[PDB]
């Protein structure tokens, strides 16, 4: 259960 991968696209949200 990676939840690194929620860490980032938390930010691809409003930067990306």
Given at each position: ?16
């Amino acid at each position: 259960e990676k939840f690194r991968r929620y860490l980032s696209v938390f930010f691809r949200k409003h930067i990306t």
